[PDB]
Amino acid sequence: MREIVHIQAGQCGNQIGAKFWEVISDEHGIDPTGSYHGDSDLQLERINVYYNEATGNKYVPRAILVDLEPGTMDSVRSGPFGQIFRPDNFVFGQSGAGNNWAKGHYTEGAELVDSVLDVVRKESESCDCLQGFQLTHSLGGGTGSGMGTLLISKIREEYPDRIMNTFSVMPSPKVSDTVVEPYNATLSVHQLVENTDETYCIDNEALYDICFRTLKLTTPTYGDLNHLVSATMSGVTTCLRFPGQLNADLRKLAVNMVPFPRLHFFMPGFAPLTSRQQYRALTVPELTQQMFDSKNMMAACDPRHGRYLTVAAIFRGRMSMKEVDEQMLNVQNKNSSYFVEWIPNNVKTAVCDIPPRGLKMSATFIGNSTAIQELFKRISEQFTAMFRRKAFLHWYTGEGMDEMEFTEAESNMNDLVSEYQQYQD
Amino acid sequence: MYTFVVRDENSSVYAEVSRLLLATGQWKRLRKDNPRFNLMLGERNRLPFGRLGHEPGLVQLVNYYRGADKLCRKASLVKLIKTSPELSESCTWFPESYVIYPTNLTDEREVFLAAYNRRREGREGNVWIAKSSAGAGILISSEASELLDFIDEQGQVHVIQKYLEKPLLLEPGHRKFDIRSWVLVDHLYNIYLYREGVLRTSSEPYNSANFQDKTCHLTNHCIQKEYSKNYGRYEEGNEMFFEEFNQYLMDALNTTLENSILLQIKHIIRSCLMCIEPAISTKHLHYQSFQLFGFDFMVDEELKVWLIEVNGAPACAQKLYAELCQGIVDVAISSVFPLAPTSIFIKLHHHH
Amino acid sequence: MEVIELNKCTSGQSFEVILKPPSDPSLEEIQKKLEAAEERRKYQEAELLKHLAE
Amino acid sequence: MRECISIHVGQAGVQIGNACWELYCLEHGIQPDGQMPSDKTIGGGDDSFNTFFSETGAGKHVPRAVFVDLEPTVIDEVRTGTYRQLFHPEQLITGKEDAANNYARGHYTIGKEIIDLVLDRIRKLADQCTGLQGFLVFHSFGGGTGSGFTSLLMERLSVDYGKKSKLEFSIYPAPQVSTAVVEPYNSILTTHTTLEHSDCAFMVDNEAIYDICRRNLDIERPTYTNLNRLISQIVSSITASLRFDGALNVDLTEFQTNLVPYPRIHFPLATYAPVISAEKAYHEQLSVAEITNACFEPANQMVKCDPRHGKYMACCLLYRGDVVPKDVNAAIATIKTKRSIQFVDWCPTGFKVGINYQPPTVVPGGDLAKVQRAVCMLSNTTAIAEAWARLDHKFDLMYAKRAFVHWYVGEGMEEGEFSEAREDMAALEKDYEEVGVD
Numbered sequence A: 001m002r003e004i005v006h007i008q009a010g011q012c013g014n015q016i017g018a019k020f021w022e023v024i025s026d027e028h029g030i031d032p033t034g035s036y037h038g039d040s041d042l043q044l045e046r047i048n049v050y051y052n053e054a055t056g057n058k059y060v061p062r063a064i065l066v067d068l069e070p071g072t073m074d075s076v077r078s079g080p081f082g083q084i085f086r087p088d089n090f091v092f093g094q095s096g097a098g099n100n101w102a103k104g105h106y107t108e109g110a111e112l113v114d115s116v117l118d119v120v121r122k123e124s125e126s127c128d129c130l131q132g133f134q135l136t137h138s139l140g141g142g143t144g145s146g147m148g149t150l151l152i153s154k155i156r157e158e159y160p161d162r163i164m165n166t167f168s169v170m171p172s173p174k175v176s177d178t179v180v181e182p183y184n185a186t187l188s189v190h191q192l193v194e195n196t197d198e199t200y201c202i203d204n205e206a207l208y209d210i211c212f213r214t215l216k217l218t219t220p221t222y223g224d225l226n227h228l229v230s231a232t233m234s235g236v237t238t239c240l241r242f243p244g245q246l247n248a249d250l251r252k253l254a255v256n257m258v259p260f261p262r263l264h265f266f267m268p269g270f271a272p273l274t275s276r277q278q279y280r281a282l283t284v285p286e287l288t289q290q291m292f293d294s295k296n297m298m299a300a301c302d303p304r305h306g307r308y309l310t311v312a313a314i315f316r317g318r319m320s321m322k323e324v325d326e327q328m329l330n331v332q333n334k335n336s337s338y339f340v341e342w343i344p345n346n347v348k349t350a351v352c353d354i355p356p357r358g359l360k361m362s363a364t365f366i367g368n369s370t371a372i373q374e375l376f377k378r379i380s381e382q383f384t385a386m387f388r389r390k391a392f393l394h395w396y397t398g399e400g401m402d403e404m405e406f407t408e409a410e411s412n413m414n415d416l417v418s419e420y421q422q423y424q425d
Numbered sequence B: 001m002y003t004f005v006v007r008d009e010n011s012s013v014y015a016e017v018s019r020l021l022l023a024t025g026q027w028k029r030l031r032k033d034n035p036r037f038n039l040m041l042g043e044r045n046r047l048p049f050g051r052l053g054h055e056p057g058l059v060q061l062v063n064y065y066r067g068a069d070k071l072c073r074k075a076s077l078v079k080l081i082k083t084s085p086e087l088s089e090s091c092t093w094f095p096e097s098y099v100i101y102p103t104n105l106t107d108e109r110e111v112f113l114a115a116y117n118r119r120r121e122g123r124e125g126n127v128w129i130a131k132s133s134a135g136a137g138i139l140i141s142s143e144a145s146e147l148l149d150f151i152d153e154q155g156q157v158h159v160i161q162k163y164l165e166k167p168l169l170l171e172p173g174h175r176k177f178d179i180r181s182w183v184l185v186d187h188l189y190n191i192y193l194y195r196e197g198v199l200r201t202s203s204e205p206y207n208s209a210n211f212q213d214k215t216c217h218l219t220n221h222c223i224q225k226e227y228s229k230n231y232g233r234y235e236e237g238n239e240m241f242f243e244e245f246n247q248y249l250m251d252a253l254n255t256t257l258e259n260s261i262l263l264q265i266k267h268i269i270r271s272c273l274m275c276i277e278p279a280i281s282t283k284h285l286h287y288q289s290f291q292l293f294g295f296d297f298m299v300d301e302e303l304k305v306w307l308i309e310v311n312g313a314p315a316c317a318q319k320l321y322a323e324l325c326q327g328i329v330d331v332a333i334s335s336v337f338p339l340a341p342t343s344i345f346i347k348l349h350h351h352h
Numbered sequence C: 001m002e003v004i005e006l007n008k009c010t011s012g013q014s015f016e017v018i019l020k021p022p023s024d025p026s027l028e029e030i031q032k033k034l035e036a037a038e039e040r041r042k043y044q045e046a047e048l049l050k051h052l053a054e
Numbered sequence D: 001m002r003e004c005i006s007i008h009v010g011q012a013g014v015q016i017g018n019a020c021w022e023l024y025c026l027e028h029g030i031q032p033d034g035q036m037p038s039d040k041t042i043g044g045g046d047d048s049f050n051t052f053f054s055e056t057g058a059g060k061h062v063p064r065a066v067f068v069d070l071e072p073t074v075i076d077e078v079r080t081g082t083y084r085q086l087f088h089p090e091q092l093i094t095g096k097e098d099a100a101n102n103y104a105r106g107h108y109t110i111g112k113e114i115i116d117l118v119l120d121r122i123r124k125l126a127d128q129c130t131g132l133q134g135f136l137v138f139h140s141f142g143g144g145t146g147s148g149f150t151s152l153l154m155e156r157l158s159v160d161y162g163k164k165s166k167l168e169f170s171i172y173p174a175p176q177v178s179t180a181v182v183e184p185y186n187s188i189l190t191t192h193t194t195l196e197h198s199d200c201a202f203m204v205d206n207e208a209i210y211d212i213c214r215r216n217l218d219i220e221r222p223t224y225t226n227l228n229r230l231i232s233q234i235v236s237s238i239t240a241s242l243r244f245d246g247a248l249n250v251d252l253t254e255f256q257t258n259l260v261p262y263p264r265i266h267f268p269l270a271t272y273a274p275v276i277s278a279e280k281a282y283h284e285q286l287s288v289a290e291i292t293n294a295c296f297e298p299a300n301q302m303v304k305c306d307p308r309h310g311k312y313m314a315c316c317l318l319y320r321g322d323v324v325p326k327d328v329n330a331a332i333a334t335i336k337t338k339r340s341i342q343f344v345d346w347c348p349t350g351f352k353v354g355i356n357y358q359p360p361t362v363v364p365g366g367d368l369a370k371v372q373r374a375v376c377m378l379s380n381t382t383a384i385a386e387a388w389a390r391l392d393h394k395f396d397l398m399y400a401k402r403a404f405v406h407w408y409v410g411e412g413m414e415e416g417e418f419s420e421a422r423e424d425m426a427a428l429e430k431d432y433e434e435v436g437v438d
């Protein structure tokens, strides 16, 4: 009974979080009312990992919904599966965070954090043996970014020896809400370097390009982007939610994926990604070629610009496990210049029989590549472009921050980049 | 797309094989420490064989037979010939040899002196040559006292073998020589003999009344090109190829190279390699091996062939690099990693 | 090629063939090791909480 | 009659242990409910099989085993499995969360908190023994529990049972079968702290079992069940002398006496034959010489290496089935004239031989076909040092960058224990080279 407590904060956090629960609930057979209507025991074997069991054979997600304004969560509560969440697990304010990291982290957020921790404590107290936490949020706004990382710091203070993982949506000028996104992202990245064991970096620019170029969507919406994140989140947690010869909790996964404590920012990937020629069967060779193609990866980083420290791939569906090994060993042994040679056997593959909804088979890619430094370089560049002129800084000094804190975040992230650069050589 | 690594930057041969592999556009070279490779061009000493054939999904090939040193070491070859029933001590094509350890260190010192006294008393020619693998350090002498004292002044194992006092002398010139043959053994253990050999001749007249000057007795390419004063007079680089050496034997001795010499050379290659096959074969091993060998022979005035030594990391004649190196890639490398004639080799068939 | 020490019973037998003749830490010290590592975990956790308290 | 307590640590040890006791029961005719008809002494007796099974007044034959795992999912398969009736609850010990493939976690952090509970449960089995010989400890090298908690158990077992012998069955990590990146660290850490506490250890390289399962049994992608049943046959061959009437390897002390002249060099190489797929219509039953010749083919070794390029220090031939001494010696003579058997000058060139007339038992519906005779060779070769070299090299690659080291330090381990353990493996590698090379 290795439970995971899920937390989703802010607009992005809750909309991506909502679709995540919508997807896995479907895979586990839970309907919008929380009643199980599946047909296989495999759907219930590891069901307690993400769901609590109430009276009458009901299943309630172990999810805490946090936000500083009521809008997004009011939409979730009225959404498809909105009825399935514990009413007490909605923690929200009314002021909002105005896309301001300082407001979510120091002022508006500080006022609300204790009641969120009150709900986390309540969910953890009922866990037979807490694996750890996972948080969905964006880094470019105010609540998910500023208050999200405040929550991580206070969760760590209270549960220091538990695993803390995040799915973090990185900002991009191409898919931007406000110009202060580099400020909020750089401030958040410093918190994450210290206080998370694994952070899946989801670049809104990569999500957009995939919807536009690969999926052939003329005008992608946030919903379209969130469909991709839902599918990816379901894929990375497949080995936690379904039975198999894996027998690995969050800590064992982290131990084997993170060779250095600060270099724990992952590039996720999914396959297939087909436009609507969608019923065609996808061969294992096609799954492997796509899953390793940059155009299928969601960090907007070209893996050929760096080297993989570690790689993990989950295959879902009824396929030839012999053919899976042949193709995976065919990709490494045909691009060995992009894997570090000083970590023996740093590519691990798993297979799961249960495929996602409406897919004969799929592949989810989890890569710890030094090419992720390109993502932090872009953020650092945009940050400095404004900070050198102190542009838009008054929004943050008015919340009690000093310029010194900005200088430090800058250095911390440039250090992170320099740290990636030296392991790539 | 096949990958290989290079771990011997001093191999003239495989430096060309590596150059050809890349030219095919179907082989890729990796760093010398990358374990994900198909072919290893390994180092000469302490090649980590134990780390081959454990990479999932990789067929790994190496250009050295683990255990072939038994054949390519002076004192090892002597012990192998005397203790191998396939070869016996009555081996008719290997000069009488003994393993002699310096007195500062089994050993065959007393056994050597026994046969030595027999020759001295029997009026027979009793000239021996002392040598060791630690040589560029050779001593040819007719007195046993000098041979043993030369070994004690050193500190490594030596071998004393009979000096062929009646070597076949080429004419004109009255000069010694030796025959180098290159032999390729592939993963299946087919024994291929390169159709092209070389004679490394001595540019000096053979003088049997003065072993002091080691220029007319040692036919090495370095000694002839450093101390001999008539280097390159009769043949360019003191190297005569089979076509010329064959026409000479027809005009001089009314015999051919095949009948008079090559039958014995092929017999000696088969005997040595078949002997150690059970000990070094990779047929049932987790990796595959091949190796190029340099056999060095002597020919006496009776047209009998003698085995001198076997070189495990041999060089090649400048003129024969292209053809031989291509032959390696054809039968040794591509035979296991095929790419998207009239063979240059002579398959010495045998039973495995 | 000699056989020696031939032992026979209802369920089998065993013998020997010769082809050629021939030519700790105390219970206390372990407790210290265990507690030494535990103390280093306490120190590291003290620094983490001191860092978070800052 | 002297007893042997089996200890299974971590996932690999527990699952392998599960497949051994299944085989033990089929070999001694013990039903899943623990009953044994042929045992005419109810609730008592000092027979050969009593070294591994105690008896209740109600006629139940209970294994003398302890299952330990820091996480409960694997041992819960035993609690509800076919043989759930054999063990009583006190014999199955499970924690809450595992060692996460972290040696320091299984040895220090978690090991410290459960060690006294395991020792107590082991004392319970010891208190039923009128003359305990020692312990058989099954574990993996790569697992955080199998490596980390085992080494601590071996340190304490030496304290509480000084005069007792301790044998290991260790699973050597291989990337074919499921493996992690940090397993080379755990392998060397555990071999260092366990070395001076193990009298004799049989390493099974998962790569070897994987290849034998694909080549002989024709299994496309073998599972743990395929691997474990194959491994238990070898374990059964090695422990049969302790459970059956015989004269060779009759107690654990005899394993060190026959296979280990130098204490540190206590890793005999195991070879087994024949392994015949049961799916085969009908195989030609191999002869004594043929299966004896197979013991010198690398393809049937438990650890992939080349014995032709080492030196033998000892050698045991354990036959099961229709085998008589005449056939053995006839085959041995034939092999000395063919193979490359290089013995060390300070060790007799001989073979201790054991024959058990009962042929190998095979789990019904398993992958192994019934054969009329099989042999397991236990030979102490310097050639097995290749496995230490391979593993030591993977350790060096990662440790040069200090990769993953922070995970161990975070659990209270000092970084110095890494280099101290690696320098011990360097000394171990030199010991083999002094015994083999010239």
Ligand SMILES: Nc1nc2c(ncn2[C@@H]2O[C@H](COP(=O)(O)OP(=O)(O)OP(=O)(O)O)[C@@H](O)[C@H]2O)c(=O)[nH]1
Pocket (backbone or CB within 6 Å): D009, D010, D011, D012, D013, D015, D016, D069, D070, D098, D099, D100, D101, D102, D106, D140, D141, D142, D143, D144, D145, D146, D147, D171, D172, D173, D174, D177, D178, D179, D180, D183, D206, D209, D224, D227, D228, D231
């Ligand atoms: N042959 C065989 N190997 C196994 C088996 N189970 C696990 N392994 C091997 O053991 C290694 C992993 O260690 P585990 O035994 O699973 O880990 P553990 O001892 O339970 O310790 P934890 O880290 O706490 O889980 C891998 O190299 C596996 O190949 C098994 O049933 N049979």
Ligand SMILES: Nc1ncnc2c1ncn2[C@@H]1O[C@H](COP(=O)(O)OP(=O)(O)CP(=O)(O)O)[C@@H](O)[C@H]1O
Pocket (backbone or CB within 6 Å): B095, B129, B131, B135, B136, B161, B162, B163, B164, B165, B176, B177, B178, B217, B218, B219, B220, B296, B298, B308, B309, B311
């Ligand atoms: N018993 C013998 N009788 C006649 N000549 C001999 C001999 N032993 C050695 N030689 C001479 O010495 C030369 C070969 O020396 P050797 O091969 O032992 O040294 P080496 O190994 O450093 C040269 P390489 O390995 O390059 O062929 C030959 O040219 C031969 O003429």
Ligand SMILES: Nc1nc2c(ncn2[C@@H]2O[C@H](COP(=O)(O)OP(=O)(O)O)[C@@H](O)[C@H]2O)c(=O)[nH]1
Pocket (backbone or CB within 6 Å): A009, A010, A011, A012, A013, A015, A016, A097, A098, A099, A100, A138, A139, A140, A141, A142, A143, A144, A145, A169, A170, A171, A172, A175, A176, A177, A181, A204, A207, A222, A223, A225, A226
């Ligand atoms: N992928 C995705 N990104 C979003 C979504 N909503 C907002 N974002 C991104 O997140 C950032 C805005 O932060 P937001 O979550 O709205 O701020 P918060 O509500 O204060 O936490 C910008 O970079 C947006 O591009 C969404 O639904 N999906």
Ligand SMILES: Cc1nnc(N2CCCCC2)s1
Pocket (backbone or CB within 6 Å): A236, A237, A239, A253, A257, A312, A313, A314, A348, A349, A350, A366
């Ligand atoms: C979250 C996860 N991080 N790693 C994972 N894998 C371990 C290796 C096999 C595939 C699954 S799942």
Ligand SMILES: Cc1nnc(N2CCCCC2)s1
Pocket (backbone or CB within 6 Å): A246, A247, A248, A252, A253, A256, A257, A310, A311, A312, A345, A346, A347, A348, D179, D180, D181
């Ligand atoms: C059990 C395991 N859980 N995770 C694993 N890996 C993740 C990918 C890199 C190597 C290790 S093995």
Ligand SMILES: [Ca+2]
Pocket (backbone or CB within 6 Å): A111
């Ligand atoms: Ca307020």
Ligand SMILES: [Ca+2]
Pocket (backbone or CB within 6 Å): D039, D040, D041, D042, D043, D044, D045, D046, D047, D055
């Ligand atoms: Ca009884």
Ligand SMILES: [Ca+2]
Pocket (backbone or CB within 6 Å): C024, D158, D162, D196, D197
């Ligand atoms: Ca002891």
Ligand SMILES: [Mg+2]
Pocket (backbone or CB within 6 Å): A011, A012, A141, A177
């Ligand atoms: Mg917003």
Ligand SMILES: [Mg+2]
Pocket (backbone or CB within 6 Å): B133, B309, B311
């Ligand atoms: Mg030489």
Ligand SMILES: [Mg+2]
Pocket (backbone or CB within 6 Å): A247, D010, D011, D071, D098, D143, D145
């Ligand atoms: Mg485990």
